[PDB]
Design a protein around this ligand. Structure first.
Ligand SMILES: CCCCCCCCCCCCCCCCCC(=O)OC[C@H](COP(=O)([O-])OCC(O)COP(=O)([O-])OC[C@@H](COC(=O)CCCCCCCCCCCCCCCCC)OC(=O)CCCCCCCCCCCCCCCCC)OC(=O)CCCCCCCCCCCCCCCCC
Ligand SMILES: CCCCCCCCCCCCCCCCCC(=O)OC[C@H](COP(=O)([O-])OCC[N+](C)(C)C)OC(=O)CCCCCCCCCCCCCCCCC
Ligand SMILES: CCCCCCCCCCCCCCCCCC(=O)OC[C@H](COP(=O)(O)OCCN)OC(=O)CCCCCCCCCCCCCCCCC
Ligand code: SF4
Ligand code: SF4
Ligand code: SF4
Ligand code: SF4
Ligand code: SF4
Ligand code: FES
Ligand SMILES: [Zn+2]
Lengths: 101, 114, 115, 96, 205, 178, 126, 112, 264, 103, 207
């Protein structure tokens, strides 16, 4: 900003852009260093009723993996259809703003 | 008592491989004391080769022998090529490791170690 | 008609000016080789399903682009690549013979987790 | 306070100092031994007893979330004085 | 970009250099830009999303010639799309808490630790022992700026992992160097080391 | 979605004007003159260089640098030898030995930190339930000797007695966000 | 590639880079860790452990920390059974002294015994 | 700005005057580090940057880390941090400048 | 056949002698039910009510520490009712418990901590003021801090049934029930330091071992005692080449869980 | 100067991270993922956290996820800056390094 | 619906289970103990004689196009007689799905390489060899990858000490970097942290 209406013109022409509106330096356009105190919120599990950890325990809804074709034990394993691990990934669509840079 | 063999179906073929490896090392030692500018003779190197070979003379399973030969060929590659410097080669000689005595009484005088 | 596309997007993947013919060739070859398999082999049945399905798709649609969209395999060159891959796999499986009992069962607790 | 030993080395608040015959004092030759001259025991002793009219008082230290966990102290024994376990503040039942 | 993109020297250094075919890339195990510059449509932020991705719009830059130039362009445009994403993350950021409201995984706040017994216990335990993790094994991968960064994490019913391998994008990228360098010179090999975005803290680790 | 970066090129149409423009670009070095102009523009801009050690780089209260053991305003030490700090220190840099102080309180005799092992992670000050161990703002504590970087209870206590005026204010600022 | 007749005891020492010292002069201990009497939990008395002999620990003159020349000072391995641990030890060439597992004996317990007419189970502390 | 102080990164050890050990030093890399240092011409100084270089740091108890670069080369100044703020590394550079301010070599030669 | 009876634990069946309790059966199938007052060598007392389980097709919950097992009973250890009973009992135990974990020598080896983390809730809805109790002084070996007593009566039952002193009891009633003696009296027997081991909540602690370490630091070496000729089995806890304490082991034939003060 | 074979010899910066981690807890092991790729830190923390959360069967809250995405993209920008500029340096162009490191 | 727990969909479970049945009945000669997890992940365990056939089928087959080798690991479990659990994590871009294949090995029981299938496995198998001691067959250049040039041992084996057996320094006498037995100023402190109370009753091991 210290520039003087001539160096600014010169460098804006040399670069081809309006740099004075977009500066690499921070002149008082930044949040202060001394902010007020906050009042953080609390999550949903801060109630005093209908809050039993036995309901909201996900760490214990886990279960050992389901077993197919276990040979050494049970669950060993018209004709069926050829199956996939998942349906084929769809084809993407090119953007509508800048698809051809 | 029945297992899968890695390369050798018996100890004699493993011994053939071990001998091939000994020949390779015995032939290489001079080239690497020349190249690496080691400050030892050619006899010390071959004595060290023989000692490292005898270090595992007690083995009888051909699979352990095959894996030892694989490791030895890996090292011989690292050495034929200069991927390893004189530092790693002289690591074998332990020029600084104070040699712990095998005398029960000295081991008794210095420390509680058996 | 829809001219041979100027180029795919994948690098090293050349355009095929005879896509409908290459596909028929490869699928008919795959079928002809799947006969040497035992009929109870699941590889044979499944691969016959897939190949006849895609072959009928090819015979039903000459439009390369509608075929692409009807075949869910990307470009028609990726499909040809996968056809020849499946053919080579059919050969290799004829050689390996996986349609046989389990070669060896595991020791007692090899897949027990935790332990 | 910071008392010295026959060798001149200062005794820390832990009671630690090297013996005159200890070789480990060369590290302090041409250098110094860093001690903390503000012994917390003497300081917390210099503080007075806070009287109270309730038999059970709490202590968070000070500043709330800037102190220590809130503990409750019984003050029945009129001869003794209740001391927080985190801080060393003393409390006494005013009316006994 | 003005310094580099349309400069004939940068082009002569990064064009037709370090070429990778799509199938060779897949096989060698590339990921990210090393995969897109060759023309492969793949991004773990649109496929297999792992966070509010799928709530934030952005475009994937794709190359045609799998050369150092197309990858450089992909990276520039990924930076631009990162700006596009940051704009949305700023404008739509929800109120609420920041860590799971389950004090057996995420420690409780200080003011609650210093007045609540349960929270103090949980803090003490999370910070001395930790949280027990039910047994199992995952392979989670994200679209790190280098590529697919993944971790195979095996757990007993303990507070410590039994095995944690890091899958680093750069291991396979560097393994592919001998191939990508075939028919090239030293300076080209430098350019190729660069176009892979190589960092060795993840490769050697 | 996706976009192309170098496929924009379409079928070739060429005129005399286009040919002459490309020729001038190839003969007069147009595109390079623009990089020259950019570098020129940067010459007439203000450099981002600060004049260290007189004017210094910004920081935030949360900055975690040098460690210090604090006290209560009475002068009593905040540490109670609970040992969470060394139980979590992922570098195993902390070392503690406790003993009943003569007055009966629970206090330490040893509290050592190998600042060559600390990764400056902050886990110790978020584990301390009494806000005793902190990671102060000071980062200008380099030495000429490795031994100087092995802090004990007295060193950390002196640092606390040296920076309290700053540590306390930064805490007062940041302690609502925790 | 058919099978082979080895007919000997396994030995892996030569493939583990373990020095002669820490194979010949090491006595492993195999045991089920004993319950900690400060707690009534019995979940760490299930898996068999392998622990090595303790060696010297000398204060460091500078600070006063504990030093060692024992790499295996903190080696602990976890096994599901005793034979597995014995096999691992034999394999790696170590010497072991095993310690059987201590299970508490089942105990008769009755809340009425606390209230009896003629026996000494009669308690005076309700 | 380093050059502001006269500092310039030269890539050849035969032209350098100081080496900043900026990160972890493995056993596979220590020979090369000692070789490079040896190849630097006296007067040569060394600066340990970070906690990995000073005492191994977060990887102190690893099988592939030297617990301090001061085992392989002699160190003039230790810069702590993980990582050290660039401001701190500059503080260390200037500390080195002062240490050099206090070499007093020719006075010693004249006193001999 | 020999008077055994079939019983289930979440379906799994097990045959148990008559008089066997729910707790012993759940153990016989590898399940350990929470506890604060049952100790396997002391008279039963249904005080903590932390052992509560529900029985299939039964309205209320029974104390597994004291209820004998009946034929065909199915015991639901991990059902909603059991979980909620445990959570409630934890709320109640921790309501008046002091925030002392970082000055409590029992930290890291506290049954209350682990049972709160494994069976209880992670929050406090207590918005009131706790209580406090003036600490006793029963001797130079056992340190008493009775704001942390959960009134489990183990100390009392041990002193009476195993040591044979009958000097400990409960003074008062209600929430102001003060375990301990009514008068100043040193509780110096030769089996006194075991009350430390059976007090789960650090109210009773070793004055020697006070503050000196934490359980995770210690390395535990299994050894034996020599002060006597009984051969008591012990664990020797060490911390950086230094003996920190002596802690007993289990040997049903010698020293089931006890050792003399001279030994520890 | 024509290259006929490249033999990358990695391992000069192996540290045993994957073993120390076994010797640590999960939180106590998190910083390794920052120290792994040291120009895209937050992404590694994010992968680790996501894996641990999967194993725990918990869901981080919305605001935390949005912050994770914000800083993940900021790290993408950091890493692409570093990549492009070191690329240029190793090729000859040196000024972009200085222009973008101020950012 | 609950905000802390993780949303769970059974559709992916079903998809992966059906594909697991597919693989099991199309490769019976090798497949053992297919299984799927609470988190949606497919795990196919096999006999090591089936490595190359399984991986080639999963790469080349049409309904299975796992042609990107993400990772290749090992896992030391000293308990079982075959310690090393070799893992092959794979990815299908055509189906946006992953899969994991596992085998088992031993100190003296090598397996076959898959560089003929996935060239990405050269360095990963070198890493497995350097870290655990598993030897692979028909590998072009099987040497060390991460360890020092004269390093003895396989450090990721649970039986290998975290700090190793040797330690490096510089000796003016010889003017070289030398390797001496380990000796520490502070010994690593082993913390026993496992709680003695069962934490997850769904994984309880019956006696
Ligand atoms: C000489 C004139 C050219 C330099 C100049 O600054 O004026 C051109 C003037 C400054 O351009 P600017 O970059 O926008 O000004 C920056 C701030 O205004 C800078 O404003 P400031 O508030 O920061 O204070 C600036 C102050 C600086 O205060 C000083 O006196 C220090 C001067 C440095 C001495 C070295 O005054 C000057 O800058 C006058 C510069 C005098 C030339 C000094 C170098 C000649 C040394 C002689 C060799 C012996 O631009 C023009 O008017 C057109 C260019 C003229 C072409 C010649
Ligand atoms: C166009 C090019 C312009 C640049 C060139 C201009 C350079 C002119 C510099 C003039 C300064 C002259 C003094 C420089 C001497 C520095 C040499 C030195 O440091 O050696 C110390 C030496 C050390 O002496 P010493 O006796 O203590 O060494 C003892 C042995 N060692 C070193 C192993 C411990 O001092 C001298 O002997 C030099 C005496 C100064 C006069 C020399 C003429
Ligand atoms: C009737 C008329 C009769 C008289 C007959 C003459 C008629 C006029 C003819 C005018 C001809 C134009 C002047 C000739 C000079 C330019 C030569 C040239 O064009 O070389 C171009 C060369 C190739 O560029 P490239 O894009 O890679 O194309 C490759 C081909 N496919 O690339 C280059 O050579 C340029 C790249 C060089 C890069 C190095 C850095 C350059 C720095 C630029 C500084 C500019 C400042 C000039 C200062 C001059 C002051 C002395
Ligand atoms: S900041 Fe982290 S590494 Fe440093 S002392 Fe504290 S807990 Fe340890
Ligand atoms: S966490 Fe705080 S109170 Fe506890 S030992 Fe460490 S410094 Fe002391
Ligand atoms: S930032 Fe930390 S981990 Fe990285 S090299 Fe520096 S000290 Fe080591
Ligand atoms: S003092 Fe301890 S053992 Fe005695 S009743 Fe209270 S908690 Fe139980
Ligand atoms: S008894 Fe347990 S819960 Fe109570 S203060 Fe002591 S450690 Fe904490
Ligand atoms: S264990 Fe049953 S009431 Fe205490
Ligand atoms: Zn207080």
């Amino acid at each position: 900003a210290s520039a003087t209406r001539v160096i600014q013109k010169l460098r804006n022409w040399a670069s081809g852009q309006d740099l004075q509106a977009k500066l690499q330096l921070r002149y008082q356009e930044i949040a202060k260093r001394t902010q007020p105190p906050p009042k953080l919120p609390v999550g949903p599990s801060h109630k005093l009723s209908n809050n039993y950890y036995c309901t909201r325990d996900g760490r214990r809804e886990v279960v050992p993996p389901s077993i197919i074709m276990s040979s050494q034990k049970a669950l060993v394993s018209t004709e069926k259809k050829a199956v996939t691990p998942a349906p084929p990934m769809k084809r993407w669509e090119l953007s509508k703003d800048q698809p051809y840079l | 008592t029945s297992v899968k063999p890695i390369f050798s179906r018996d100890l004699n073929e493993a011994k053939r491989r071990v001998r091939e490896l000994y020949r390779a090392w015995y032939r290489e030692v001079p080239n690497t004391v020349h190249l690496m500018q080691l400050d030892i003779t050619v006899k010390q190197g071959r004595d060290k080769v023989r000692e490292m070979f005898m270090k595992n003379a007690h083995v009888t399973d051909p699979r352990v022998v095959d894996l030892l030969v694989i490791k030895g060929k890996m090292e011989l590659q690292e050495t034929i090529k200069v991927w390893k410097q004189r530092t790693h080669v002289m690591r074998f000689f332990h020029e600084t490791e104070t040699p712990r005595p095998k005398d029960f009484l000295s081991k008794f005088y210095m420390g509680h170690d058996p | 008609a829809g001219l041979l596309k100027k180029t795919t997007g994948l690098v090293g993947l050349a355009v095929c000016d005879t896509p409908h013919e290459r596909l028929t060739i490869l699928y008919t070859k795959t079928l002809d080789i799947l006969k040497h398999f035992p009929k109870h082999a699941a590889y044979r049945k499944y691969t016959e399903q897939i190949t006849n399905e895609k072959l009928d798709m090819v015979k039903a649609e000459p439009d390369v682009k509608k075929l692409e969209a009807l075949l869910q395999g990307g470009e028609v060159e990726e499909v040809i690549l996968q056809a020849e891959k499946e053919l080579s796999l059919a050969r290799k499986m004829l050689k390996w013979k996986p349609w046989e009992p389990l070669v060896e069962e595991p020791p007692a607790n090899q897949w027990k987790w935790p332990i | 306070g910071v008392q010295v030993s026959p060798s001149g080395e200062k005794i820390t608040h832990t009671g630690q100092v090297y013996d005159e015959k200890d070789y480990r004092r060369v590290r302090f030759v041409d250098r110094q031994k860093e001690v903390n001259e503000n012994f917390a025991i003497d300081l917390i002793a210099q503080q007075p007893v806070n009287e109270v009219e309730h038999r059970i008082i709490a202590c968070d230290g000070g500043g709330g979330a800037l102190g220590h966990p809130k503990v409750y102290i019984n003050l029945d024994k009129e001869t003794k004085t209740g001391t927080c376990g985190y801080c060393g503040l003393q409390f006494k039942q005013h009316h006994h | 970009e003005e310094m580099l993109t349309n400069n004939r020297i940068w082009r002569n250094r990064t064009v037709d250099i370090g070429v990778v075919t799509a199938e060779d890339a897949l096989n060698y195990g590339f990921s990210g830009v090393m995969l897109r510059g060759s023309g492969i449509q793949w991004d773990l932020r649109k496929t297999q999303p792992y966070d509010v991705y799928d709530q934030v719009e952005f475009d994937v830059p794709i190359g045609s010639r799998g050369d150092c130039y197309d990858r450089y362009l992909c990276r520039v445009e990924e930076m631009r799309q990162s700006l596009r994403i940051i704009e949305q993350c700023l404008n739509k950021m929800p109120p609420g808490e920041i860590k799971v409201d389950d004090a057996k995984v995420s420690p409780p706040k200080r003011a609650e630790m210093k007045t609540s017994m349960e929270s103090l216990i949980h803090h003490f335990k999370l910070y001395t022992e930790g949280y027990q993790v039910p047994p199992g094994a995952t392979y989670t991968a994200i679209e790190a700026p280098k590529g697919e960064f993944g971790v195979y994490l095996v757990s007993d019913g303990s507070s410590r992992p039994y095995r944690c391998k890091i899958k680093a994008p750069g291991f396979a990228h560097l393994a592919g160097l001998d191939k990508m360098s075939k028919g090239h010179m030293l300076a080209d090999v430098v350019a190729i080391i660069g176009t892979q975005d190589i960092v060795f803290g993840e490769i050697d680790r | 979605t996706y976009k192309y970066v170098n496929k924009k090129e379409q079928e070739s149409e060429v005129d005399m004007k286009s040919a002459t423009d490309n020729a001038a670009r190839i003969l007069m070095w147009t595109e390079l003159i623009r990089g020259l102009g950019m570098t020129l523009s940067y010459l007439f801009r203000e450099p981002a260089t600060i004049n260290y050690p007189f004017e210094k780089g910004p920081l935030s209260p949360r900055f975690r640098g040098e460690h210090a053991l604090r006290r209560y305003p009475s002068g009593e030490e905040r540490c109670i030898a609970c040992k969470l700090c060394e139980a979590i220190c992922p570098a195993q840099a902390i070392t503690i030995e406790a003993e009943p102080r003569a007055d009966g309180s629970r206090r330490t005799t040893r509290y050592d930190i190998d600042m060559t092992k600390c990764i400056y992670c902050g886990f110790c000050q978020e584990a301390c339930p009494v806000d005793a161990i902190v990671e102060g703002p000071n980062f200008e504590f380099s030495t000429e000797t490795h031994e100087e970087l092995l802090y004990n209870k007295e060193k950390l206590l002196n640092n606390g007695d040296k920076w309290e005026a700053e540590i306390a204010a930064n805490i007062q600022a940041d302690y609502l966000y925790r | 590639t058919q099978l082979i007749t080895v007919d000997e005891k396994l030995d892996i020492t030569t493939l583990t880079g373990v020095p002669e010292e820490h194979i010949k002069t090491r006595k492993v201990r195999i045991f089920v860790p004993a319950r900690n009497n400060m707690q009534s939990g019995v979940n760490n008395t299930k898996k068999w452990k392998m622990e090595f002999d303790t060696r010297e620990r000398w204060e460091n003159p500078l600070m006063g920390w504990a030093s060692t020349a024992d790499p295996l000072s903190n080696m602990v391995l976890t096994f599901s059974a005793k034979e597995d641990a014995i096999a691992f030890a034999e394999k790696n060439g170590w010497s072991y002294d095993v310690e059987e597992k201590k299970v508490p004996k089942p105990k008769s317990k009755s809340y009425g015994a606390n209230f009896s007419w003629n026996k000494r189970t009669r308690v005076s502390t309700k | 700005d380093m050059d502001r102080f006269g500092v310039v990164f030269r890539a050849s050890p035969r032209q350098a005057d100081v080496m900043i050990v900026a990160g972890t030093l493995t056993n596979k890399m220590a020979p090369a580090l000692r070789k490079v240092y040896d190849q630097m011409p006296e007067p040569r100084y060394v600066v340990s940057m970070g906690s990995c270089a000073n005492g191994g740091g977060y990887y102190h108890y690893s099988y592939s880390v030297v617990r301090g670069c001061d085992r392989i080369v002699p160190v003039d100044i230790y810069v702590p941090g993980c990582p050290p703020t660039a401001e701190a590394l500059l503080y260390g550079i200037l500390q080195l400048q002062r240490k050099i301010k206090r070499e007093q070599k020719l006075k010693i030669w004249y006193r001999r | 056949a020999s008077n055994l009876i079939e019983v289930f634990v979440d379906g799994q069946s097990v045959m148990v002698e008559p008089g066997t309790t729910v707790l012993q059966a759940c153990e016989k199938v590898g399940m350990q039910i929470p506890r604060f007052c049952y100790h396997e060598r002391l008279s039963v007392a249904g005080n903590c009510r932390m052992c509560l389980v529900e029985i299939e097709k039964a309205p209320k919950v029974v104390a597994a520490c004291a209820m004998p097992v009946m034929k065909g009973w199915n015991i639901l250890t991990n059902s909603e009712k059991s979980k909620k009973a445990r959570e409630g009992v934890m709320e109640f135990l921790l309501a008046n418990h002091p925030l002392d974990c970082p000055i409590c020598d029992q930290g890291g080896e506290c049954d209350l901590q682990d049972q709160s983390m494994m069976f209880g809730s992670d929050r406090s809805r207590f918005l009131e003021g706790k209580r406090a109790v003036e600490d006793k002084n029963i001797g130079p070996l056992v340190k008493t801090i009775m704001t942390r007593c959960i009134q489990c009566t183990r100390c009392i039952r041990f002193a009476s049934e195993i040591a044979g002193v009958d000097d400990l009891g409960t003074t008062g009633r209600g929430n102001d029930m003060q375990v301990g003696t009514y008068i100043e009296k040193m509780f110096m027997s030769e089996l006194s330091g075991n009350v430390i081991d059976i007090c789960p909540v650090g109210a009773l602690t070793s004055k020697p071992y006070a503050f000196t370490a934490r359980p995770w630091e210690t390395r535990k070496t299994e050894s034996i005692d020599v002060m006597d000729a009984v051969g008591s089995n012990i664990v020797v806890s060490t911390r950086t080449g230094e003996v920190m304490r002596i802690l007993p082991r289990m040997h049903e034939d010698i020293n089931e869980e006890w050792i003399s003060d001279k030994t520890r | 100067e024509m290259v006929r074979k490249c033999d990358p010899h990695i391992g000069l910066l192996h540290r045993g991270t994957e073993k120390l981690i076994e010797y640590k807890t999960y939180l106590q092991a998190l910083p390794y993922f920052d120290r792994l790729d040291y120009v895209s830190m937050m992404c590694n923390e994010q992968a680790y956290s996501i894996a641990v959360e999967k194993l725990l069967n918990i869901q981080p809250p919305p605001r935390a996820q949005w912050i994770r995405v914000l800083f993940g993209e900021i790290t993408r920008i950091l890493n692409h800056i570093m990549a492009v500029t070191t690329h240029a340096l190793d090729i000859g162009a040196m000024t972009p390094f200085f222009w973008m490191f101020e950012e | 619906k609950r905000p802390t727990v993780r949303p769970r969909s059974d559709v992916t479970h079903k998809q992966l289970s059906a594909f697991g049945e597919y693989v099991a009945e199309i490769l019976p000669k090798y497949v053992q103990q297919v299984q799927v997890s609470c988190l949606d992940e497919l795990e196919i365990c096999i006999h090591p004689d089936g490595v190359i056939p399984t991986l080639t089928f999963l790469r080349d087959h049409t309904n299975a196009q796992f042609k990107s080798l993400a990772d290749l690991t090992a896992v030391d479990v000293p308990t079982r007689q075959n310690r090393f659990e070799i893992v092959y994590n794979l990815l299908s871009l055509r189906f946006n799905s992953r899969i994991r294949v596992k085998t088992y090995a031993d100190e003296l029981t090598p397996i076959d390489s898959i560089v003929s299938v996935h060239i990405a496995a050269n360095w990963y198998e070198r890493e497995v060899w350097d870290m655990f001691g598993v030897f692979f067959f028909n590998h072009p250049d099987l040497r060390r990858i991460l360890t020092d040039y004269g390093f003895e041992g396989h450090p990721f084996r649970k039986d290998f000490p975290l700090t190793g057996y040797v330690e490096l320094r510089y000796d003016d006498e010889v003017k070289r970097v030398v390797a001496e037995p380990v000796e520490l100023a502070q010994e690593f402190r082993k913390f026993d942290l496992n709680s003695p109370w069962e934490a997850f009753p769904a994984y309880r091991q019956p006696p």
